[PDB]
Amino acid sequence: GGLVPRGSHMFIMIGERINGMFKDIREAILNKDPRPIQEWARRQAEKGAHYLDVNTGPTADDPVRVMEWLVKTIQEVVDLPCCLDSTNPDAIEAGLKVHRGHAMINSTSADQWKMDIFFPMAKKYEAAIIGLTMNEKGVPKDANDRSQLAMELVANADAHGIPMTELYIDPLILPVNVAQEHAVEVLETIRQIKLMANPAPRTVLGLSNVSQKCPDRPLINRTYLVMAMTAGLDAAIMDVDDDALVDAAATAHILLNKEIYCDSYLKTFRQK
Amino acid sequence: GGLVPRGSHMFIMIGERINGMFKDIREAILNKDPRPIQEWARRQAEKGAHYLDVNTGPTADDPVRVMEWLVKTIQEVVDLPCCLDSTNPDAIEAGLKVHRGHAMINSTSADQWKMDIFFPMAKKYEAAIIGLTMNEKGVPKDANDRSQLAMELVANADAHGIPMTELYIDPLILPVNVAQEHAVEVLETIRQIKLMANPAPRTVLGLSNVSQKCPDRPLINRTYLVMAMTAGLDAAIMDVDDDALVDAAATAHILLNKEIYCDSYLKTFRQK
Numbered sequence A, B: 001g002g003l004v005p006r007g008s009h010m011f012i013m014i015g016e017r018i019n020g021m022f023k024d025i026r027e028a029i030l031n032k033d034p035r036p037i038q039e040w041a042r043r044q045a046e047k048g049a050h051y052l053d054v055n056t057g058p059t060a061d062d063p064v065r066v067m068e069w070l071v072k073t074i075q076e077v078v079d080l081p082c083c084l085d086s087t088n089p090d091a092i093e094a095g096l097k098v099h100r101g102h103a104m105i106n107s108t109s110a111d112q113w114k115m116d117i118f119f120p121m122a123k124k125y126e127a128a129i130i131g132l133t134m135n136e137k138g139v140p141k142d143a144n145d146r147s148q149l150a151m152e153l154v155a156n157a158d159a160h161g162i163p164m165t166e167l168y169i170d171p172l173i174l175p176v177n178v179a180q181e182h183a184v185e186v187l188e189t190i191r192q193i194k195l196m197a198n199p200a201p202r203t204v205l206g207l208s209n210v211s212q213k214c215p216d217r218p219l220i221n222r223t224y225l226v227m228a229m230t231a232g233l234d235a236a237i238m239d240v241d242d243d244a245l246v247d248a249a250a251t252a253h254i255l256l257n258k259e260i261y262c263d264s265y266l267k268t269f270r271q272k
């Protein structure tokens, strides 16, 4: 370490776009139209996503059915794993049941009853699992307070036999315009997490959160991603359709010496 | 700390452009034409530089006279301090003698006879001083080996009564295409330096080195600057004419919480 990364694993890009918070996805789900879902699956895959996040959004429909449908629909057209994005454990498990390959669970909080439910499920289905550094008492402001919750996630994951390489800790980034002070604490938390065990737990962020409902988001997203990667970030749920963002990531990845430099590294990175 | 900065000092931009390695500067110096020097002084000032680097470049002329002339010529049209960029101590001192305000000396190596000459000169003229993490044995590859030389710089500066706030340690960045492995070690060195004393020594880089004689430099420069700033960088000799670079810096500066967020932060940053 500290800033010299222990490993050289490719940065993991999790395409954010198949998420019922978006109208087109919400309506495709309403009309059970698989076309918009498959279009976004293909697009994200073509941009180099390693996982596709899958989030039902708000719905009065049975989320179990919706999640199932999304997963099957996506995996019908691309050979990519899903990052199953829900607080509903039955929605998650339904997705895991029809999922081809190793999925990612998104996510468990540091709440004990959440951990007790989600960890055995990741173990059972051999899925990676995201653990958010938060509980019912809320999201901690301080890096140190986030880190405690991180420690608690590590302990529980390990207690379920889940390897650290399968555990992705999310310190929860918040919009810089209304929660500016969090952004730097998150960086420091990422650094701390990378110290917690050997091998270390991985780290992940909902990157776009940092600019949500801010003006001129693309600059802010790509700046923060570079900062986070520097701090040790292993993965991000992010807009893989943003070419400038992915260029930024590929450049940081080279500058961290995790992939051998060549003149065509911007392309190389997207294939990896 | 660690990544949460102790302070909130504005990032220090040192305009790189008045440097005899550039033909127009070299020729302005040859013809003793003050116009190109003053033009670049004004331009850089308008882009928000806090210092202007001043480097004679290669010349068969008396560097003492050249440096004097450059400093007077620059300060004739802008109210900015100079970052006097030479290995010739008499060139440096000549510049310090005619310099208006507090200059920066660029630089001393960790060579003992260099330190013994340059440190008393900074003290005497009340100039900030850059110390490069290198000596006659060469530039160390490892962060740890760079850090030792950093430690030696701190010790000597302190032994001359120079405050840490006046000492800028340069771990020497090298082009990523031929010395890729250095870039991450430099980051780790910056982090380490920020730990060496209280208050900590400052840090600085010749940023453009990272892409020198590489294709598509602007992306690489701005990515690395963001990484370096994240690691703790306080200043950089850089191309302040590169708007994308300065946007990148301003965004990182906000994300580090060193300046209160507002929607117009890209402008705000350039005035500060």
Ligand SMILES: Nc1nc2c(c(=O)[nH]1)N[C@@H](CNc1ccc(C(=O)N[C@@H](CCC(=O)O)C(=O)O)cc1)CN2
Binding pocket: A016, A017, A019, A021, A022, A023, A085, A106, A107, A130, A132, A170, A172, A173, A205, A206, A207, A208, A209, A212, A213, A237
């Ligand atoms: N583990 C984890 N999972 C997450 C998040 C996280 O943090 N951590 N955060 C979220 C990450 N995904 C997104 C997806 C889109 C946006 C986004 O920004 N949406 C547009 C929608 C615009 C439109 O509707 O057209 C907006 O402006 O609000 C933000 C985060 C959801 N999942």
Ligand SMILES: Nc1nc2c(c(=O)[nH]1)N[C@@H](CNc1ccc(C(=O)N[C@@H](CCC(=O)O)C(=O)O)cc1)CN2
Binding pocket: B016, B017, B019, B021, B022, B023, B085, B106, B107, B130, B132, B170, B172, B173, B205, B206, B207, B208, B209, B212, B213, B237
């Ligand atoms: N303390 C310190 N001082 C420094 C450096 C450093 O590290 N540390 N490194 C240098 C930083 N300044 C520059 C200025 C320009 C360029 C640059 O890249 N020049 C163009 C010139 C093109 C042209 O001639 O038109 C090029 O392509 O080579 C690189 C570093 C000099 N001073």
